[PDB]
Design an enzyme around this catalytic site. Structure first.
Site, PDB file in Angstrom:
ATOM      1  N   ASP A   1       0.819  -1.197   0.000  1.00  0.00           N
ATOM      2  CA  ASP A   1       0.000   0.000   0.000  1.00  0.00           C
ATOM      3  C   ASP A   1       0.868   1.269   0.000  1.00  0.00           C
ATOM      4  O   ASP A   1       0.668   2.154   0.832  1.00  0.00           O
ATOM      5  CB  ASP A   1      -0.948   0.010   1.208  1.00  0.00           C
ATOM      6  CG  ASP A   1      -1.757  -1.263   1.357  1.00  0.00           C
ATOM      7  OD1 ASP A   1      -2.232  -1.843   0.350  1.00  0.00           O
ATOM      8  OD2 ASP A   1      -1.957  -1.650   2.523  1.00  0.00           O
TER       9      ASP A   1
ATOM     10  N   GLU B   1     -11.386   0.678  -3.346  1.00  0.00           N
ATOM     11  CA  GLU B   1     -10.506   1.141  -2.265  1.00  0.00           C
ATOM     12  C   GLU B   1      -9.291   1.877  -2.854  1.00  0.00           C
ATOM     13  O   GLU B   1      -9.219   2.081  -4.060  1.00  0.00           O
ATOM     14  CB  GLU B   1     -10.095  -0.039  -1.351  1.00  0.00           C
ATOM     15  CG  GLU B   1      -9.154  -1.055  -1.982  1.00  0.00           C
ATOM     16  CD  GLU B   1      -9.064  -2.371  -1.231  1.00  0.00           C
ATOM     17  OE1 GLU B   1      -8.251  -3.226  -1.639  1.00  0.00           O
ATOM     18  OE2 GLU B   1      -9.782  -2.575  -0.227  1.00  0.00           O
TER      19      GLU B   1
HETATM   20  O1  LIG Z   1     -11.545  -4.675   2.777  1.00  0.00           O
HETATM   21  C1  LIG Z   1     -10.937  -5.474   1.763  1.00  0.00           C
HETATM   22  C2  LIG Z   1     -11.451  -6.902   1.844  1.00  0.00           C
HETATM   23  O2  LIG Z   1     -12.867  -6.935   1.625  1.00  0.00           O
HETATM   24  C3  LIG Z   1     -10.749  -7.750   0.785  1.00  0.00           C
HETATM   25  O3  LIG Z   1     -11.198  -9.093   0.901  1.00  0.00           O
HETATM   26  C4  LIG Z   1     -10.896  -9.922  -0.223  1.00  0.00           C
HETATM   27  C5  LIG Z   1     -12.213 -10.310  -0.891  1.00  0.00           C
HETATM   28  O4  LIG Z   1     -12.011 -11.341  -1.856  1.00  0.00           O
HETATM   29  C6  LIG Z   1     -11.357 -12.504  -1.343  1.00  0.00           C
HETATM   30  O5  LIG Z   1     -11.246 -13.490  -2.376  1.00  0.00           O
HETATM   31  C7  LIG Z   1      -9.966 -12.158  -0.839  1.00  0.00           C
HETATM   32  O6  LIG Z   1      -9.315 -13.337  -0.351  1.00  0.00           O
HETATM   33  C8  LIG Z   1     -10.064 -11.112   0.257  1.00  0.00           C
HETATM   34  O7  LIG Z   1      -8.744 -10.661   0.574  1.00  0.00           O
HETATM   35  O8  LIG Z   1      -9.325  -7.707   0.964  1.00  0.00           O
HETATM   36  C9  LIG Z   1      -8.788  -6.393   0.849  1.00  0.00           C
HETATM   37  C10 LIG Z   1      -9.417  -5.481   1.902  1.00  0.00           C
HETATM   38  O9  LIG Z   1      -8.919  -4.148   1.771  1.00  0.00           O
HETATM   39  O1  LIG Z   2      -6.254  -0.998   3.577  1.00  0.00           O
HETATM   40  C1  LIG Z   2      -5.485  -1.824   2.658  1.00  0.00           C
HETATM   41  C2  LIG Z   2      -6.354  -2.147   1.442  1.00  0.00           C
HETATM   42  O2  LIG Z   2      -6.306  -1.097   0.456  1.00  0.00           O
HETATM   43  C3  LIG Z   2      -5.937  -3.458   0.769  1.00  0.00           C
HETATM   44  O3  LIG Z   2      -4.639  -3.313   0.117  1.00  0.00           O
HETATM   45  O4  LIG Z   2      -5.953  -4.549   1.703  1.00  0.00           O
HETATM   46  C4  LIG Z   2      -5.894  -4.257   3.120  1.00  0.00           C
HETATM   47  C5  LIG Z   2      -4.971  -3.076   3.366  1.00  0.00           C
HETATM   48  O5  LIG Z   2      -3.672  -3.461   2.889  1.00  0.00           O
HETATM   49 CA   LIG Z   3      -3.330   4.601  -0.229  1.00  0.00          CA
END
Ligand SMILES: O[C@@H]1[C@@H](O)[C@H](O[C@@H]2CO[C@@H](O)[C@H](O)[C@H]2O)OC[C@H]1O
Ligand SMILES: O[C@@H]1[C@@H](O)[C@@H](O)OC[C@H]1O
Ligand SMILES: [Ca+2]
Ligand SMILES: O[C@@H]1[C@@H](O)[C@H](O[C@@H]2CO[C@@H](O)[C@H](O)[C@H]2O)OC[C@H]1O
Ligand SMILES: O[C@@H]1[C@@H](O)[C@H](O)OC[C@H]1O
Ligand code: NA
Length: 330
Positions: free
Chosen positions: A18, A229
């Site tokens: 990040d 995000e």
């Molecule tokens: O908030 C974010 C999470 O919602 C995100 O979760 C992902 C969703 O899809 C899955 O297949 C992944 O394994 C899982 O990481 O992760 C990033 C976070 O910023």
């Molecule tokens: O807040 C960050 C989000 O942008 C993503 O990269 O997964 C979780 C954290 O690293």
């Molecule tokens: Ca950032």
């Protein structure tokens, strides 16, 4: 040894993610997440991202030796924060440096806090409470050419932005994804002008509108283009560039507008999908060149929660378009 010449990991002694890159005191300072192999349960709310501190990195040149300045902030010293030190950013004003960070409060609600130092390298003293009126994740604090500073923020799914439509948290049992109305406009990222002292917002938080090339809102069902995000703001030749991650479709994309608040018109892809689920970046000018800092899960052999930051040159065309980068081609 010098690093950053051919998309190799910038550091290997710790896992990093990040990356928020800034030019302070003629050096590149990078404010990334510090990933650790916590072994926490993996799920769609991101419990597997269980980071606990931040290290500031710096480079005098790109490529160049990368200096790790140690622990700049530790979760155990942040009074309001319970867990999960996620994607941070920093800003500089009047000889003070401000580290902005998302973390869960004691009620499991993401908020954004600030910590203060007299050096870009830290360490930073956290404020005792998070920023009033903040919520969700992934701050980017942008200094405009007129001296005004703006925080861009938000993340859906695990970032909880979808639970913040009424000015109150919708609760633990509310949507785990988005509005669940794919033909309505997608949720937009948030913006607020910062207070003069950089510890609070100077206005009620606003939502940013992102539209397609025809001026129609990007819809909730359009996962290739809608905000997930990792909001970032940079300015080039009078145009404001909102870039961000699309999450489940794994792109960094960008949209352009004529002022900090938008609306922003979707233009295209900045960075194609990397190794590992997440995609997170920053865009910075240094010595008259533009750079994309990003990450992947290459160093860990593909573990989504153990990342490493990388850098490559980014090319604007004079018409304002940016050349799409594919991470593993050259
Ligand atoms: O908030 C974010 C999470 O919602 C995100 O979760 C992902 C969703 O899809 C899955 O297949 C992944 O394994 C899982 O990481 O992760 C990033 C976070 O910023
Ligand atoms: O807040 C960050 C989000 O942008 C993503 O990269 O997964 C979780 C954290 O690293
Ligand atoms: Ca950032
Ligand atoms: O309801 C539960 C929450 O209590 C939990 O939230 C954590 C509580 O401890 C705090 O130190 C953390 O900040 C916070 O995230 O999350 C799980 C949920 O079921
Ligand atoms: O991107 C635009 C799309 O969203 C719309 O449906 O058709 C015209 C396109 O330019
Ligand atoms: Na393109």
């Amino acid at each position: 040894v010098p690093r950053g010449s051919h998309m190799e990991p910038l550091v290997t002694h710790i896992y990093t993610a990040d990356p928020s890159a800034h030019v302070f005191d003629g050096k590149v300072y990078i404010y990334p997440s510090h990933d650790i192999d916590a072994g926490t349960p993996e799920n769609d709310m991101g419990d597997h991202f269980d980071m606990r501190d931040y290290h500031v990195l710096s480079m005098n040149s790109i490529p160049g030796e990368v200096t790790d300045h140690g622990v700049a902030l530790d979760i155990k010293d942040i009074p309001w924060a319970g867990r999960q030190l996620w994607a941070p950013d920093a800003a500089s004003k009047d000889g003070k440096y401000y580290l902005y960070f998302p973390a869960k409060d004691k009620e499991d609600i993401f908020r954004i806090g600030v910590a203060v130092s007299d050096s870009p390298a830290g360490p930073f003293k956290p404020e005792s409470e998070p920023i009033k009126g903040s919520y969700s994740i992934d701050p980017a604090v942008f200094k405009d050419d007129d001296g005004k500073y703006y925080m861009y923020f938000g993340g859906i799914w695990g970032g909880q932005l979808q639970r913040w439509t009424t000015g109150e948290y919708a609760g633990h049992d509310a949507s785990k994804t988005d509005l669940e109305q794919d033909d309505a406009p997608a949720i937009g990222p948030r913006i607020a002008l910062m207070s003069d002292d950089m510890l609070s917002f100077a206005e009620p938080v606003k939502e940013i509108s992102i539209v397609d090339e025809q001026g129609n809102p990007i819809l909730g069902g359009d996962h290739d283009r809608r905000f997930f995000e990792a909001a970032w703001m940079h300015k080039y030749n009078g145009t404001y560039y909102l870039s961000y991650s699309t999450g489940d479709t794994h792109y960094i994309v960008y949209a352009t507008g004529d002022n900090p608040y938008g609306p922003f018109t979707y233009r295209g892809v900045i960075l194609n999908p990397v190794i590992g689920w997440t995609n997170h970046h920053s865009i910075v000018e240094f010595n008259g060149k533009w750079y994309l800092f990003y990450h992947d899960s290459s160093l860990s052999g593909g573990k989504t929660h153990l990342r490493c930051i990388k850098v490559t040159e980014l090319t604007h065309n004079a018409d304002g378009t940016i050349e799409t980068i594919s991470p593993y081609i050259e």
